[model samples]
Each structure stands twice: as structure tokens, then as C-alpha cells.
Target chain A: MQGVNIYNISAGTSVDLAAPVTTGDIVTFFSSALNLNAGAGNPNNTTLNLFAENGAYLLHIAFRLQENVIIFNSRQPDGPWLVEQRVSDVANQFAGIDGKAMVTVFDHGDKYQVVINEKTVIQYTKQISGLTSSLSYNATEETSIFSTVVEAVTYTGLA
Target chain B: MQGVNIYNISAGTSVDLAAPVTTGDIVTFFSSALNLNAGAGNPNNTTLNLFAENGAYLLHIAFRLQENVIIFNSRQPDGPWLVEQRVSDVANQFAGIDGKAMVTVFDHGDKYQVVINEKTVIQYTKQISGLTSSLSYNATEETSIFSTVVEAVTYTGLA
Candidate 1:
């Protein structure tokens, strides 16, 4: 089976997708350029997340305008979110004139891997021990025309 | 749910396992001395992989005889598999006379971390964007009495 989700997030709003996922599936998300309003405490400070049911695990990607960098992170419930890797887009790769960004998650039966704009940024082997079943987008003090797409396919190897 | 897989590989034979997985899961694989046959080219030159359905994404671990190093890699469909990290066992840590080695993958909802022989190897934030539904073992032109154990467990938070 396949699924797709899209969102247009406003400041201070958090949203999640309504898709059903299982083991051995893949998911991808893309966002349009974020248009941050002036005086926004942290303009363009937005986060994209892939979370498991029960909130046991969360994979977080943050776009920081002040740093001109993208941060990769992971967390368990009630645990401090930890930074796993950081990529400097001083070239403004994600926030180019087009203002587009993308993130992908690969479900390795017991672990997960992440990619940003086709680059392998983090290679940590352990994150959570739960099924990733949903997606979340959070915007704080900023507005962005965000769009996300999620797709799931049954792994034939497990057939 | 939890699952365990074990394999005994002989000379020139590669094997793969099909497993169902989701986010927040942990997969660990360990081997006790790869017994290479006489005159086999590079006895310890073996590879372990976690692959997504359709092979769109892959996490590869290679044990190199030349440098006594362990390399971590990842790739996307039709993309060049890139090396994310390399850890040298020059101290003869993994390939001692015993020939033992181990690798583990931890599923953090958005990222994965890797461990080798109980030591954190790659704690980076990126892993794969697809679900790894299978495990693969490849041996070069050498024969060995190789035994591997794969264990997968679902992770609830640190509660």
C-alpha cells in the first residue's frame, strides 16, 4: 500500500499525518520555502519530525535560519533530544531562492536512517525500539508554506 | 514483538535474512571468529548489510583485512553508496586471533546509530530513508566457519 500527506503550517501550529505504516517501509517529506514574518523570535526555526505511536521515539530535523545549518536529532519519550549530526548549508542549500527542503527515513527492521536533500548526514545505528507510524510538523513563531509527502510499501523480502 | 536470527556460513556462501521492522527497534549481529580456509584471499574480508525493500536503501558494514578496519556506509536507489565512517581495529580489537566481530543498529524514530563490539561506532544522526526489511552477509573467495546472531527488539522509552 501507498500513502501521501501534505500540510501548510502556520506559526505555533503542529500537525501530523494520517497514514498507516508497518515494518520494512520507507517515508519521504518535502517542504516549500518557509516565509517567516519579521520580528518572529526565531524566524524560520521550524522542525519536521517522524514519531512512533505512543511517542516512544522521535526523529527530529530542524532548520535554523540563524545558523544557516540543518540539525539532525533523535529522542525517546521524556528524554532530552540529542543532536546526532549537523550539516552546514552556508551555501543556503535548503533555503535557496526556492526555499525547498527534503528529508527521508529508511526503516531498517530494527533501526532507521535519515537523508536530507539526497545527502547521507547521520549514520547512527540506534534510535528507538518502536514502530514509526506517523509524521509531525511543528512551526514556532514563523509561518511557512510547508508540504509533506509520505509513502509506504510492503517489503517483498519479508514476504 | 522481538526476533532472533543466527547463521553458520561456510566458504564462499553468502546468506540473507528477512525480518519485519519498524521505527524504534534495535537489531544486533555478532559473529565468533570467521574461520577462513587455507589460501583464501583475505579471510576476514566480509560484509554485513541491512537493506530496505527493493534495495532502495542500504546500510553496509565491511570488515577489511588490509587495515583491520570496520567501515560504515549507506546508499539510496541507484545512488553511490557513500562511506559515513570508518573505525580502525589496528589494535587488533575485532580481528584478533579469535576473529570475532559484532555490529548493532539502533532505531531512533528519525535516525539510526551503530555499534561495534559493544562500543559506539557511529552515533551520527542519519541512517536511511527506507525500511530495512532484510539482512545480508557476503563472503569473498574465502571459506570460514562463521556464525552470526541477529537479535531485534522493540524499544520502549527509558521508563
Candidate 2:
């Protein structure tokens, strides 16, 4: 497996892992509340998006602060998103003034799974009908402090 | 040229680039004050070090806050450092409460040149006298926040 890790980005900034995320790959990152201070009326929103070569999101995982929830959604090349899961209990997982949250996404042969802080939070058995070329971190509102954005891919050769 | 960029590390943390720094490789990184807060007696020190295969720093570039200066020093496998250059002017360049700085080192056939921001600050013509096998970002004392760290190597078909 070949892996690359990137860290520490301010809010509203995005970092692209030039490497593509194919089947049997994993993309993960750590988010800290130390980077979110948009003040009242504004909430922090951090998103991890996997896009195909044609520029459509194959999967999108968002940490929405206004609702204090984590949402998982996926879509085809040009199709609408299919809401996969929404876990409201995650509010406390990333709570506190100096809270830290970790997200990991595993790409399987026929399905994908989202893991938050080592727990399998959501599993989507629906196959992503297209190939993904890149993964990006998009932070909105306040600076979404991100660290250790890593992509690891495992190669499985035919016998 | 192939390049890998890593960012956002806390103080006292060291990141191994995995890739080694060869004779014609350029290693660079950006530093910002957003990550430096050591309080009263502690000072922030950021170092980009080139280590030998045996793990001794062959060359070290340090941004030292106590002296308010940028120093370039080097040492052999088991020898003391040979102070090469100390630029006092660099103190003000990164002084403000929210200042940002950049350090770039270009490895040439004969010598290595260090560039701060866009200006060529120092040139070490004294041969390294040893082989370097890896590059690392070592932060000490206070948190030396880094934004982007990139290592790019140029291939030359020369003996």
C-alpha cells in the first residue's frame, strides 16, 4: 500500500490529494474544534468529498455544526445524492471548545464504509457506479482546522 | 520533477518525508505565526534537517526565536556543527504576531543555496562531505506552525 498524509489547513481552504482513490483505498483526516471560531450566527461546516474524473462527487461526508450532526451522502456522476445516514449523536463526539474528530472512509470491492473515530458509523452497500479520481477537503464558514489528511491504497493483483 | 507537499504540524512533532533528499533535490516549507505560542520563557524553533542514512543531521536550517535570527549550520556524521551563516535581518522578516515565512533550499551539482521567501539568502559552497538519505521537519520548544512543506527533485543525467 502507498500512502500520503497532509495536515493543518485553515478554514475555507481546500487541499487536494493528487493521488486518486480507487477501490480498496482509504481516505482519512482529523478535524479539531481549535480551528473553528466563526462567532455567533455563523457555524462551521467541514466536508470531505470524493470526485470522479468528470468532476462529480461520488461520495460526500459532511460535519455540519449548525445542526450538530454528521451526514453521509453519495451520488453518481451526474445523479442526485442518495442520503445514506445522519447521526445526530455525533454532536458530542466533536463537542467541547477544543474537541477533535476523526473520519475514515474505506472503499471496498462492492461497497463502502464510513468510520468516525474508529467506529463504523455508516456502511453503504450500494456500489459507486463510477471511478473516483481525487479526494478533497472543503471547509466553510470558519477555518476548519484539518490535520493528517491521509490516503492509503492497497493493491490486489489477479492470481 | 515530482513533489510531495505536507502541512500543519504541531510543535515537538517531527515528520518524515519518506522520500530521501538526493544531490539534486529541493526541499521547501512555509511557516506561519498562527502555530507559535510558547508563552514567556519558551521560544519557538523550527528546523528543516537533512539526515544521513545513520540518522545524523547533515545540514540544519533553524528559525530560532530566542536569538531572533535564522541560522544555517551543518555537521558531519559524528562531528559538531560548523556554523555557516546567521542572518539577523531575517528576525524582522518573521517578527509580527501573525507573520509568515518560507524557506527553500536548492541542491545544485556543486553546492546548496537557501532561499528565504524569493530571495537567495545563503549559499553553502562547502561540500556536504557526506551523503544525506532523508529530510525531516523538526519543531522544538514552542509550536512552530507550518503551512506547506514540499520536496521536489530534479533528475539530471550526470555521473
Candidate 3:
């Protein structure tokens, strides 16, 4: 009932773009929790993209690739943000029987830091500017499988 | 055990000055897990010290003062390096219900970061320069109470 938007965090949609966004809003990029039995380099089935319509201007993008490293981009929302590993790569970083990847992103202005196992791995300043764009995902592929878990993007006012 | 050290990680009564320390040794500081109940400006119940005999100094000190913010210190192995705080202050930094502290000392040349609940709140650089001295604690006062939870400190290597 309060400032509700079309995109819901719980519905688990492939990609729900929050259009008509403003400069004050924040956009986060992250990957779904991969099932470890499949092993690393198990092509990440999920790919999230948020691009500006006029140009290949990307607002936010996140994907899990090779060994659970979540490569993210925001400045050039259109594409090629950069290569990054999750901060919470404890399980994935360390060789273990059951590997897991959990990376959460919180955006503040042009800066963003990733938390893994409650630790910060990477912090980057993004180039992409706005969030009023289309958001989509590809989760149906089987070989490079996507996760059943939900990937989230939150918009926060500059604090 | 591959690269594991045979020494124990348990707390001992006195400083094992003669005992050899490895770069990756993990030393823990603890109050009680239970019986820890107090607020700011109140007395602390427990204290732990890491002392070195070379300088008869107290290298590291931890106090379970009221409020979980607990006090932490590095350097000197003597006096004056004490950094004290209330439990509530530390809890707010972590934005959690309770306050807990975990410190890790990286290689000598590397800086140290204090992480509370996976967030880096403080970073102390070049700690070993003062660690070789001595360490100890003061827990006699009724107002100087400690907590029930243990604090963990892991050593990486010299710079």
C-alpha cells in the first residue's frame, strides 16, 4: 500500500524493469545462488540485464560465471561492467565438498561494495546513470543452468 | 595435517613467552557467552589480555564494558593503546541486536580491518610494529565487567 511498484521482490520474476525511475533511486546487481552439485563453470543459467532504450545504456547487470564469481556492471548499464567475485565466497573461494556463492550488493551513489560471508570483496564506482529502463533475465537454459533461488534488485533513496 | 600447526587454540593461564608463534596462529579473547548483561557507562565484568614479556607490555586488550561496543586495543604491548566503547555503540555500527567483535591481523606490512557482522568499520595499519612488546589485562574492578562471548584474533604473517 505504501509507494508500491510493479516489480515485487518475492514473485521471482525473470526480470521486471522499474521504469520511469529517477536519479535518486539506487540499482543493485547480483546473481542467483548456484546449486553446487553442478560444479564451477556450470554456465550460469541466469543473466539479468537492465538497459536504457535509446542506447545500449545499461543501468545494472549481474551474472554468475565460472566458479561462482558474480561479474557486475552499473555505470555502463548497457554492458561490460567488469569482472568481480562475490565477497561471501567462503565456500566457493575455499575448496570444499559443498560449494556455495552468496553475494549481496548495496548501492550508494556512484559507489557499490559487495559482501560475501559478511565481508567486502570489491567496491566499484559505476558509470551507468539512470534506472528507468527494461530489466530481463534468461533462466530457462539447462546446460549453463540458472538458480531456483531469487535474485533481487533494490532501489533506495540516497542516504 | 597439510599446513596446519600442532599448537592448540585454547586460552592459557599465562603468556607462553617461550612458545613459538606461527604466522597464521589464531588467538581468541572471550568473556562469558552467558551472564553478559549491562548497558553503557556501567562497570565491566571481564577482561582478556595478550601480553609479551620482552617489554613486560600488554600488546592487546579487550574489555566487555557495558553496551556491547566493547573496548579494543593494539600496539604498545604496554599501556595507552586501549580503545574503549559501549556495547550499544558497536551494536549500532553492525546494525544488529547484539555487539560482537572479530579482529584479524594480516601480514606485517598489510593493514588490519575490524569487521563487525561482515562490515568493515575500522582499519588499523601496521600493528606488528607494536605487537612484539608485551600484553596483559586488568579485571579486578567490579565496574570493569566483561561479556560472555569470546573474541577471536587470527594472525596472518609479517609484512
Candidate 4:
């Protein structure tokens, strides 16, 4: 009785989860990308966005390929970036974009654990104080996403 | 209080899980590979192996890159394959090898669920009616394994 797929994706396309992701939800992104800077003309910036219940942007993970850095921010949709997390060594972490990388963000109630390629780990506290209602992705043309999975943990042994 | 990392991986290498995988454990593999035919000169085949408590091979997933097929088998450490599952549409599933792909196998007590890139799903019943002990990977040089994670699900909330 396990049938809870969150989204469907193509070889290189953007898709949404079946339902809004909240606490206890595990979101995973699998894609191959090169942190190739496109310069000012064509900025190849990818993003992982989480939204509030009222459709406001809660958290924004900007994959700034133009600058070769990953910016984790807490800000409003149209407001200035409130708090930005600049992981000192992320520039060297996601270097092998020629191959696939798995990025996971697990919402654990008051905090979120972000596992970058399952090697580097980053944890962020709740920006505001409520649960997230939706999820979105903004993968640039350079980032070819293979899959975005929204999975939950369930224990099923006995009745 | 979230520190149950199963294995530490490199950009491209084979590794073992921290402990023998059993029920309620989730094993993940992320890597980029090609379905290119290496031909008879050099047969490039990757494998995912699960072993028993006695170090006997319980299950083996052979990535037959030379023939463009994935073989899921039940067998012994040195014995012939007892049962093999050849999914029909798998040949069309794992086509995008240039990018990263996420493969997850979750042990759910009675059955093991294999999710291929979060799309194709395959379930295998226990061959010997017991639990698995250890996990191993056999990635060829052609297959660059980015990460191998053995994670478990835990419920963390207010006490």
C-alpha cells in the first residue's frame, strides 16, 4: 500500500510535487550539471524554492553558476535577501557537475537538513516559524535534472 | 541528534556500508554512467551486491552495459543465480547516463523495493525468509559513483 509519488519529470524539464511538502517530507533532486559560469549575458542560475502556506517564498537555494557558489537565503518573494548562508567550501564541493549529483533537503519539524551530494551537510533553522506548504525548482538550461522525488518515511511491519 | 551516516564515499570509488543493512534501512547510490556498448574487447559491467550475515551473497544487480540491460538476481556467494527479474521497460528507463541518476533500495521487512530514479519501481520478496547483513557495490571504471549512502528513518519530535 505504498503509492505516494510527488512528481513526474522528463529528461530535462521542470515539474511540481503532487502535494505541498511539509514537515517530515524528504525532497530529492537528481541531475547532472556543470558549474560553468555563463557571465552577465546569460546567467545560468538554478534554484530550489520553498513556499509558505500563503504562497510566499520561505527559503531560496540559489545555484549561482555565474559566480561558482551556492547561496542559501531566507527572504521574501519580492523583498531583499534577509539571511544568506555562504558555505565557505561549497565552491569546491559541487565541482563534478559533468556527472550526476543528488541534493536532498529533509524537513524535520523546526529545522531542515540539506545534504549536498551526500558528502557535505548543512542545516538551517526555521526562518520564520511555520511549516512550508509547497515546493518548486528553477533549474537553468545547463542543469539537466533527471528526477525530483518527494518521499516520506513509513514503517510497515505488522498490523 | 541526527548522525547515522552509513558510509563515506569519494568522487568515484567502491565502498561498503557502515554496518550490514537490515529491515528499515534505505540504501542510495548516485552516479553518472553511459549505456554505451563496450563490445567483446572490454566488457564494462557494474554491480550492486547485497550479502547475508554469513557473508553470502543474497542479491545481485548486474548492470550489463555491454548488452544494454540490468539484471536483478537472487543467488549465493559462489552459486548460480536462483531467480532473475528482467524488467521489460528498464532498457528505456536508464537512458540518460551522462547525468546523475539516483537509485534507492529500501528494505521493508518482508519485501525490498528498488526505485530507479524515482520512476520505475521493482519489488523483490525475501529469497531465504531472513534479513540481509551487509551491502557492497561493484562499479566499473566506466561507471563513476558519486556517492553511496545508507540512511535510516527516525521520528524526532518533542518528547
Candidate 1 clash figure, as a count: 40
Regions of model 3 farther than 4 Å from truth: A1-14, A18-33, A37-45, A53-68, A74-103, A141-146, A149-155, B1-159
Ranking by DockQ: 4, 2, 3, 1
Instruction: Give the candidate number with the greatest lDDT.
Output: 2
Residues B35-136, candidate 2: write the lDDT tens digits: 444422233256777667776766687665566666777777777777667777544544432555556565554566776654566776643645555666
- Give fnat of each prediction, in order: 0.00, 0.00, 0.00, 0.00
Once fitted onto the true fold, the runs of candidate 4 whose alpha carbons sit more than 4 angstroms away are A1-14, A36-46, A63-70, A75-86, A95-102, A128-159, B1-14, B18-22, B29-47, B62-103, B128-159
How do the residues B14-124 of candidate 4 rate in per-residue lDDT, one tens digit apiece?
Answer: 344444456655565544344334332123255666677655656666656445566677775676757777565444655444434556666667776776654545787
Query: Which CAPRI category fits model 1?
Result: incorrect
**iRMSD per prediction, in order:** 17.9, 13.9, 16.2, 6.7
Q: Please give the interface root mean square deviation for model 1, in Å.
A: 17.9
> What's the lDDT for all of these models?
0.51, 0.53, 0.37, 0.52
Residue A91's C-alpha lDDT in candidate 2?
52
- What's the CA error at residue B65 for candidate 1, in Å? 1.7
lDDT tens digits, residue span A1-159, model 4: 332243433332434444455665556554434444433312325566667766566666666644556677676656776777756444465554443455666666787777665444568776754556556666534352222332222212111
State the lDDT of candidate 3 residue by residue for B15-97, as single tens digits. Answer: 34223323322232323222334443323444444544454333333434454555545545344554442234533543432
Clashing pairs in 4: A100-B100, B20-B133
True contacts kept of 3: 0.00
